[PDB]
Amino acid sequence: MLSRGLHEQIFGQGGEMPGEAAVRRSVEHLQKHGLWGQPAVPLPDVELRLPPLYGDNLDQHFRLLAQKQSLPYLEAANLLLQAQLPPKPPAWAWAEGWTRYGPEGEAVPVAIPEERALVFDVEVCLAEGTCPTLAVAISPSAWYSWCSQRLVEERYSWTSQLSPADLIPLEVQEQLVVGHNVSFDRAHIREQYLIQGSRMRFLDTMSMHMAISGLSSFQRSLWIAAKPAISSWDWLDISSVNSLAEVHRLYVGGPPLEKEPRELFVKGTMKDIRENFQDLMQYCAQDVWATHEVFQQQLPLFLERCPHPVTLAGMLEMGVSYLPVNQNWERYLAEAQGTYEELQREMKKSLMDLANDACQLLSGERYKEDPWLWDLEWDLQEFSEEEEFQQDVMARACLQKLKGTTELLPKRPQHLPGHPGWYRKLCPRLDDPAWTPGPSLLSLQMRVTPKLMALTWDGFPLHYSERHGWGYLVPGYNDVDIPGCWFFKLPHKDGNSCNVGSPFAKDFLPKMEDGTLQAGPGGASGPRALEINKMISFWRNAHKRISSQMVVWLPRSALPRAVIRHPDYDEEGLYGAILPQVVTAGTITRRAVEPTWLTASNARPDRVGSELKAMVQAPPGYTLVGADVDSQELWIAAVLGDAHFAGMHGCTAFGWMTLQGRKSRGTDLHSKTATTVGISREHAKIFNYGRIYGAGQPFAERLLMQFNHRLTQQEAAEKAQQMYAATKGLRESEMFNKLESIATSDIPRTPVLGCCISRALEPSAVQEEFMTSRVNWVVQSSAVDYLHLMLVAMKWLFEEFAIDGRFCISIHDEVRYLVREEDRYRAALALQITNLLTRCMFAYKLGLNDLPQSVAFFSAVDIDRCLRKEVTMDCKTPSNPTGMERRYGIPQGEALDIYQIIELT
Amino acid sequence: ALLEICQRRHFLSGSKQQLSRDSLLSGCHPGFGPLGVELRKNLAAEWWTSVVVFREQVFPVDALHHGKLRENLLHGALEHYVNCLDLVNKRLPYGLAQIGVCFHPVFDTGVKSIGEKTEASLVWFTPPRTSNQWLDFWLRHRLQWWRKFAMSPSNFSSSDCQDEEGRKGNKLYYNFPWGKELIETLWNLGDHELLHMYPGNVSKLHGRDGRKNVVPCVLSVNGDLDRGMLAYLYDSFQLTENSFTRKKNLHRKVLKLHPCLAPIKVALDVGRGPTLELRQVCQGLFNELLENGISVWPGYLETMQSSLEQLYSKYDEMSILFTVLVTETTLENGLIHLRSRDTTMKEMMHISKLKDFLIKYISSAKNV
Amino acid sequence: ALLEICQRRHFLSGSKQQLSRDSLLSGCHPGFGPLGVELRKNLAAEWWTSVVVFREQVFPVDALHHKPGPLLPGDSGKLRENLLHGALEHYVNCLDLVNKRLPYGLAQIGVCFHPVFDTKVKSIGEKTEASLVWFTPPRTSNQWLDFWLRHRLQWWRKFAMSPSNFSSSDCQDEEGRKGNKLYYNFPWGKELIETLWNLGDHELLHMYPGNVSKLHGRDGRKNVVPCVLSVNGDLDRGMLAYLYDSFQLTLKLHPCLAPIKVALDVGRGPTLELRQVCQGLFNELLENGISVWPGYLETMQSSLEQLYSKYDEMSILFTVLVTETTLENGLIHLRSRDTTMKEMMHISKLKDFLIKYISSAKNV
DNA sequence: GCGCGCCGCAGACTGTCT
DNA sequence: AGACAGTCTGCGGCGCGA
């Protein structure tokens, strides 16, 4: 029990085995590269009555859990698979929303579709909001066009409510809606934004094509450019880029699916959409029919290649996500846009002030000794006792009327004469509609924004004439390192030896912290710029995606009784929800990909709009109960480590540490070893994650080039010992024989659930010289399988015990659930039991049925009203508690009592 | 030191005596110069336009202080609560605003002194006692207003603070070279002041929020305008932030006030001619640029003609936006010389376009 | 006839029934309302036109505002305040501003405290007087005094609707060589509005030591002793001139300087919604100087009945028709000044013809 | 890793202004 | 009959969507 800091076996304690001839090898290995004499003080014991398992084994317990649910969904999928649909109905009509078409075209008005299995897609007009415009619902019974009542001239003027389609048939059943990008469709289903759960679940054909026969980022680029370096072209034809009219001919086979060159939905006029109805309906119907045929091809293949039901149930659970907004989303967007505009005006005004200060030169020729402004033009060109109200106004009027005489031109050809040429270029003409004062129309993309602020890179001209990105501005008779160092650059450029080849995509957003790159020694207006740029960079990158997110505001009737007559309820405010539009598989590693959410955003300071994660606020009477899982990729690599060389989490030094290690004290191996061997200024996590994914020595070297002023020969000779010390090579602390052995194996890739890799990366007729993506896939897909194991649990805990919730949100190794305020402790206890069961399941699949207590439970289960990294955090805005009510959160590391989950106590 | 003697040299400050630090801040300064009364007229009008007339709710309070001198400017505003809620429209949300002069006791030099502060006070009648979003809206408005007209808007900061009974409040600070100084305070008085002033009956204090009568909360936003003017002068010139040698080798003393807050905009001149007929066209231009909102500096009246560099330095230190110089060539061609405060270069332009260009410049500076 | 309770329905709770001829000439009264404060600001701007336009080297000054002054040190809660001692203290600095050019003056609008005695005790006045000090050479004192009397008489009669009643009297001379006093004829006789005193060098030589080094600024290439002639005006109101009589016109105040009765924004949308047709006139608030009363915020159609009697009280110079009849055609303006003429609004009657008829009256 | 947008920038012509 | 304002237009780079 106390061998490696492990706990007793609560379940499955009938048979125990410590192994033989393994403890000696483990001890001998841990003598080196490890102190091994740590006292390892125990965590206090926790013992509770778990809910009754089934099958007398945890694997069978999860099997019956994942088969009890997703069985009506599976039979609905089978019924949709077995159907032999009629081809098409020739007749299409408006018919006031929903209507029913049989095998032949016949108009009959029906309220709602009464069908279990259904394939559905929505086409929207980007010109007119995010409101749905076209929809067809193909079923084995009928055809079910929707038409989105577009014939009515009057619109709702935003504030979407009751506008889209409806599919839930009401109690007075189960539905597996299929579609291509079914999350975008799910945004248009209605009652998905309702706070109460819905039985309907969604399956994505894109997730199917990405899970099996998907393409890695490099692979997709190669397949695009091709519609050692050379290899067998089998994966080129086997996989596709996930766009339809490319997947359809791959799976179904036949004529290519149509592609409209006009693209009226994305860039078309409202009146253009209103007519030309039948061709758009035909295109949408062909699209949905192709999606149905691709799913019909893919479903048995997915069932065979992903047999274990936890994977399918986890994908179905990830199909349903819920982000409530609590009416402060519009205020957030308004304040973020106002702050972005204000800081942009501040930076532009600072640029104008710098330009005006530069214009104060040329008096006595004070330029050409300034290293920054020497090479500009700086040229000059020129081409009553008595009421005496008269003789004052009359003389001025005479001089005004004398404009014609001796005038060079009625329309001025001299645009601000007497000013330098670069300043004339930065000034709009004196025409009244387009006049703006000072050196306006000045931006950072122009070459004149440099040389006005120093940038401290010695002489920083940014003269984009044979520069190729960068030049002699790093380090070392003016050819040597001089502040000026800029004349006759072509014969003796030297400088940067790698030339062009860097990505050059926001590369200079870092390196402002140290690394030279300071916008002037002064402090008045120079260094204020490039700090405003830091603040507004994230919003400039993401304001298209953060704005225009579809929000459906629930009316008073749609709100439940918990929201009504609550103390935190306001009649004026209207509560809404956001569906994240996440695809359950968007990478060959089956983790969800979505640009807006699911990023490394934790309300970082010196940023304008990094509070994206915040303001996802629960409705009154509701709370977010969720936990950030502890650093898990390292644990996955460690558990792939043990049972290969030895068991009991003690075979290698990697298995010995990383779990008892803490961030507060001691070495957790995440940063401490990296900052001991190398510099690792906060970049230790990226380096460790790159090592875990097996990126290799060139990627590590290129990553370390961007972080310090280290030479290439110095990089090869020195500070590259991390690879030579962690890894012994190709067959110390790190080993890769298990991951490589999995990679060479064809079918058994996932140790836990048996999910197979995509057919592009299979060894059958495909050889991967690069080798990194497969081991990266093994690690990340094991993490995804862990997430699926968490998500299949916490269900039937909300069913057999009456708990309202089960709206999972997975961002980045964390889970959130929208639970009622009365059941938050029950949700926290259920989440802790879920984490314990998931860790025991992963260990049981990879060896032995005993788990250490350190990783057996969460550090803290955050119960909040909004979503944030920690309960004791605030956004960078001047006042987070002021305005919107915030309870500041509680950690809930320890449960209230040892009491069970059922309501009686 | 150098900034203060520069101010008194061009009379943006009061007098030579009691010129040292924390004497103008205390309010015991003798006053302001002839150009110092302006920017107390430019301010308290930009504040008035931003707060009072633009917001349809905000209305001026009754004239306060018709014994003890006033110090907070808040007591009289609550005294005029009854007349604020008019019979024809007893709408609770709208509030009161005032700009005045307040008297403060000053100790530590002995005899107690009286400090004078120009205070702008806005009292807001928030209909919910626990709304707290009107405070955030007013904080955003005040902060963006102070950052407006500022050469370095980053120096205007805000700090949260709490007092007894835990009233919630914000205190704006400006980063002077010696240290941060308090400019404006937002405080939730919490309706206890209204109960103290009117303990007789509560029915008069109810106001209509939506359809229902509720007791309001009062929010006091009090800013100072003398120290605000000192902040605006210190924002211009230099606050010892830059210093250095290679940053600014040029030695130019210029007060880069905002065009919408500059005391006097254009300065008329006479030079390069002994005819003395130029005085006539300069007086005509003087009459032309007025009644358009532009205030002109009659530098053409002086008999003595100093050097152009000294005149330009004087106009820069007086925050002159544009310098107009009228040669004898204006009698022939009509071309007048125009120099800008921002850019030292000068250009020849026709006299007819001058007023239109100046009013367009002021308007566009106001918008931006 | 009283005009304080009948015509001035908008008043203050303090001394609501105690308002008469007394205590209004004197400063012992509750302050003026929002309309009174805005009218005082307008009158202060019109007086400041004599500072910005009549720019004979006239500059603004600010007094220390103390009721006793800057203490009483070294000399053997005040009799009166006049904003004059601050001007004579700023004499040296404001003479340094010019190149010692003597014909220059200093003007200031500020609060002056006057103790009230023998009330029908020691109350604070705060009569908000306006002062001009006008440092002048002694030889041209009479001509400059007559000059300032003539322009002050013209300025005070400029807003006066009725002839006479802005009388000027030579009175007597005790404080200085000579002076003149302006009297407005209320129904309770003529009372002082503005006074002139040719003080001379006596006060300036009294405040400073006997030896002179910074004084005697040059005029006509000869340094001469400076004479002082002071213009002091109580900022009283022309409300009695606004309502000369009621007669059949029933109680109307003519808007010569009134912030209200030249305004906008009323109507709140004809179809009980979409108020941006009228509220969208808020561009008259930006870059202009038009004061607009938000009557649309009232949105009480029951109170808007009896339009003839509602024009007496509300008077925002136009109203939008309540019935959904003239939403189109781009015209809502009506009841302009005395007679309804009902013309188009976009460029004719809103943002234009409101700036006009005021500047033309200003020039007249 | 690619492709199609959106800006900067330097032409080569165009069009009055002489 | 020159000659320098401006109007498309071919280049480099940045950047964001798969």
Query: Both ends of chain C: CA-CA distance in Å?
Result: 30
> What is the DSSP-derived secondary structure letter of residue C163?
S
Final residue before a domain boundary, out of C258, C286, C301: C258
Query: Rounded to an integer, what distance in angstroms lies between the CA atom of residue A516 and that of residue A152?
Result: 62
Element at C193 (helix H, strand E): strand C189-198
Q: How many CB atoms lie within 10 A of CB B141?
A: 16
Q: Nearest nt (C1') to A410 (CA)?
A: D17
Q: How many CB atoms lie within 10 A of CB A26?
A: 22
SS3 percent helix, strand, coil of chain A, rounded to 5, is 30, 5, 60
Helices and strands (H and E) in chain A: how many = 26, 11
Query: Rounded to an integer, what distance in angstroms lies between the CA atom of residue C136 and that of residue B122?
Result: 43
**Number of inter-chain CB pairs under 8 A, B vs C:** 119
Total domains in the fold of chain B: 2
**Number of inter-chain CB pairs under 8 A, A vs B:** 122
Sheet holding B59-60, edge to edge: B59-60, B96-106, B113-126, B217-224, B180-188, B168-175, B156-162
Among candidate residues A608, A679, A645, A758, the one with its CA nearest the CA of residue A242: A758
Chain E footprint positions (protein CB, under 7 Å): 5-6, 12-18
Q: Taking the CA atoms of chain A, what radius of gyration do you get in angstroms? A: 33
Residues of chain B numbered 291-350 and touching chain C (CB < 8 Å): 291, 295-296, 298, 301-304
In the numeric block, the tokens 């995804």 are attached to A784
Query: Rounded to an integer, what distance in angstroms lies between the CA atom of residue A215 and that of residue A211?
Result: 9
Query: Both ends of chain A: CA-CA distance in Å?
Result: 32
Q: Do C39 and C103 have their domain in common?
A: yes
**What is the residue type of A408?**
L
Kindly provide the resolution of this structure in angstroms, with one decimal: 2.9
Q: Do B180 and B246 have their domain in common?
A: yes
A816 known ligand binder: no
Q: Do C122 and C157 have their domain in common?
A: yes
Which residues on chain B are in Cβ contact (under 8 Å) with A356? 342-343
- B311 within 8 A of B269, measured Cβ to Cβ: yes
Among candidate residues A113, A209, A239, the one with its CA nearest the CA of residue A760: A239
Compute the CA torsion angle A672, A676, A681, A682 (nearest 10 deg): -20
Q: Do C295 and C317 have their domain in common?
A: yes
Q: Do C243 and C341 have their domain in common?
A: no
Total number of residues shown for chain C: 364
Q: Do C84 and C163 have their domain in common?
A: yes
H-helix segments, chain B? 2-9, 34-37, 46-48, 75-79, 81-84, 133-147, 192-197, 226-235, 278-289, 308-317, 329-332, 354-367
- The two tokens of residue A140 are 């084995």
Strands A201-204 and A176-179 turn out to be: parallel
* Distances A868 to A594, A603, A816, C116 between C-alpha atoms, Å: 18, 8, 10, 66
Among candidate residues A73, A545, A503, A494, the one with its CA nearest the CA of residue A312: A73
- A469 within 8 A of A502, measured Cβ to Cβ: yes
Between helices A532-546 and A329-359, what is the axis angle to 10°? 140
User: Cα A31 from chain centroid?
Assistant: 42
| Secondary structure (3-state) at C89 | helix
> What is the DSSP-derived secondary structure letter of residue B183?
E
Element at C241 (helix H, strand E): helix C239-242
Asked whether residue A242, judged by its CB, lies under 7 Å from any atom of the DNA or RNA strand E, the reply is: yes
Among candidate residues C56, C78, C8, the one with its CA nearest the CA of residue C242: C8
Q: How many CB atoms lie within 10 A of CB A363?
A: 12
Residue A63: how many CA atoms within 13 Å on its side-chain side? 11
List the chains bordering chain B where 3 or more Cβ pairs fall under 8 Å. Answer: A, C
A670 known ligand binder: no
Q: Say how far A425 CA is from D12 C1', in Å.
A: 20
- A760 within 8 A of A239, measured Cβ to Cβ: yes
Asked whether residue A548, judged by its CB, lies under 7 Å from any atom of the DNA or RNA strand E, the reply is: no
C66, closest residue in chain B (CA to CA) = B114
Strands B296-298 and B266-270 turn out to be: parallel
b/e per residue A45-70 (b: at least 16 CB within 10 A): eeeeeeeebeeeebeebbbebbeebb
Compute the CA torsion angle B327, B330, B331, B333 (nearest 10 deg): 140
**What is the residue type of A815?**
V
- The two tokens of residue A396 are 């001025």
> What is the DSSP-derived secondary structure letter of residue C143?
H
C285, closest residue in chain B (CA to CA) = B54
* CATH, residue B308: 3.40.50.800
Q: Do B10 and B68 have their domain in common?
A: yes
Instruction: Say whether residue C68 is in contact with chain B using an 8 A CB cutoff.
Output: no
Question: At B161, phi and psi to the nearest 5?
Answer: -150, 160
Among candidate residues B362, B325, B321, B324, the one with its CA nearest the CA of residue B341: B321
User: Cα A712 from chain centroid?
Assistant: 33
Residues of chain A with CATH 3.30.420.390: 84-297
| Secondary structure (3-state) at A203 | strand
Among candidate residues A621, A585, A588, A8, the one with its CA nearest the CA of residue A324: A621
Final residue before a domain boundary, out of B262, B282, B300: B262
Asked whether residue A220, judged by its CB, lies under 7 Å from any atom of the DNA or RNA strand D, the reply is: yes
In the numeric block, the tokens 């007339």 are attached to B53
Which are the catalytic amino acids of A? 121
**What is the residue type of B164?**
E
Q: How many CB atoms lie within 10 A of CB A336?
A: 20
Cross-chain Cβ contact B287/A391 below 8 Å: no
Query: Rounded to an integer, what distance in angstroms lies between the CA atom of residue C274 and that of residue C279?
Result: 9
Among candidate residues A475, A462, A456, A451, the one with its CA nearest the CA of residue A516: A456
H-helix segments, A4-95? 23-31, 58-68, 71-82
- B216 within 8 A of B125, measured Cβ to Cβ: yes
Q: Nearest nt (C1') to A542 (CA)?
A: E16
DSSP letters of C34-86?
HHHHHHHHHHHHHHHHHHHTS-SSEEE------SS-S---S----S---SHHH
* Distances B108 to A123, B20, B23, C73 between C-alpha atoms, Å: 76, 15, 12, 18
- A420 within 8 A of A377, measured Cβ to Cβ: yes
Residue A510: how many CA atoms within 13 Å on its side-chain side? 9
Strands C227-234 and C135-136 turn out to be: antiparallel
- The two tokens of residue B184 are 């404006």
Among candidate residues A382, A373, A383, A376, the one with its CA nearest the CA of residue A418: A382
Q: Do C115 and C250 have their domain in common?
A: yes
Query: Rounded to an integer, what distance in angstroms lies between the CA atom of residue A567 and that of residue C89?
Result: 64
Which residues on chain A are in Cβ contact (under 8 Å) with B151? 353, 525
Which residues on chain B are in Cβ contact (under 8 Å) with C285? 53-54
Cross-chain Cβ contact A430/B365 below 8 Å: no
Total number of residues shown for chain B: 368
- C224 within 8 A of C216, measured Cβ to Cβ: yes
Asked whether residue A545, judged by its CB, lies under 7 Å from any atom of the DNA or RNA strand D, the reply is: no
Please list every residue in chain B followed by a chain break, i.e. its C lies more than 2.5 Å from the next written N: 66, 109
Query: Rounded to an integer, what distance in angstroms lies between the CA atom of residue A569 and that of residue A821?
Result: 14
* CATH, residue C228: 3.30.930.10
Query: Rounded to an integer, what distance in angstroms lies between the CA atom of residue A619 and that of residue A569?
Result: 8
Helices and strands (H and E) in chain B: how many = 12, 14
Q: How many CB atoms lie within 10 A of CB C122?
A: 9
B29, closest residue in chain C (CA to CA) = C64
Determine if residue B15 is left, alpha or beta; phi over 0 gives left, psi from -120 to 50 gives alpha, anything else beta.
beta
Asked whether residue A414, judged by its CB, lies under 7 Å from any atom of the DNA or RNA strand D, the reply is: no
Top-tier CATH class for A84-297: alpha beta
Q: Do B179 and B147 have their domain in common?
A: yes
| Secondary structure (3-state) at A383 | coil
Query: Rounded to an integer, what distance in angstroms lies between the CA atom of residue C219 and that of residue A179?
Result: 95
Neighbouring residues of C182: CB distance < 8 A, sequence distance ≥ 6: C152, C153, C156, C166, C167, C168, C192, C193, C194, C195, C233
- A643 within 8 A of A573, measured Cβ to Cβ: no
Q: Do C29 and C105 have their domain in common?
A: yes
Among candidate residues B214, B151, B159, the one with its CA nearest the CA of residue B181: B159
Instruction: Say whether residue C34 is in contact with chain B using an 8 A CB cutoff.
Output: yes
Q: Nearest nt (C1') to A241 (CA)?
A: E18
The parent domain of residue C272 ranges over 259-364
> What is the DSSP-derived secondary structure letter of residue C31?
P
Experimental method reported for this structure: cryo-EM
Q: Do B168 and B291 have their domain in common?
A: no
User: Cα A590 from chain centroid?
Assistant: 14
- The two tokens of residue A187 are 């945004």
DSSP letters of A280-343?
HHHHHHHHHHHHHHHHHHHHHHHHHHS-SHHHHHHHHHHH---EE-TT-HHHHHHHHHHHHHHH
Question: At B91, phi and psi to the nearest 5?
Answer: -60, 120
> What is the DSSP-derived secondary structure letter of residue A51?
P
Total number of residues shown for chain A: 905
| Secondary structure (3-state) at A809 | strand
User: How many degrees, rounded to 5, is the angle at CA A826 between CA A825 and CA A827?
Assistant: 90
- The two tokens of residue B60 are 């001026």
Q: Do C237 and C269 have their domain in common?
A: no
Final residue before a domain boundary, out of C238, C258, C278: C258
Query: Rounded to an integer, what distance in angstroms lies between the CA atom of residue A66 and that of residue A73?
Result: 12
Between helices A737-744 and A633-641, what is the axis angle to 10°? 80
Of B133, B242, B334, the CB nearest to A402: B334
DSSP letters of A216-273?
-HHHHHHHHHT------THHHHH---S-TTTHHHHHT-SSPPP--SS-HHHH--HHHH
A633 known ligand binder: yes
Query: Rounded to an integer, what distance in angstroms lies between the CA atom of residue B148 and that of residue B51?
Result: 14
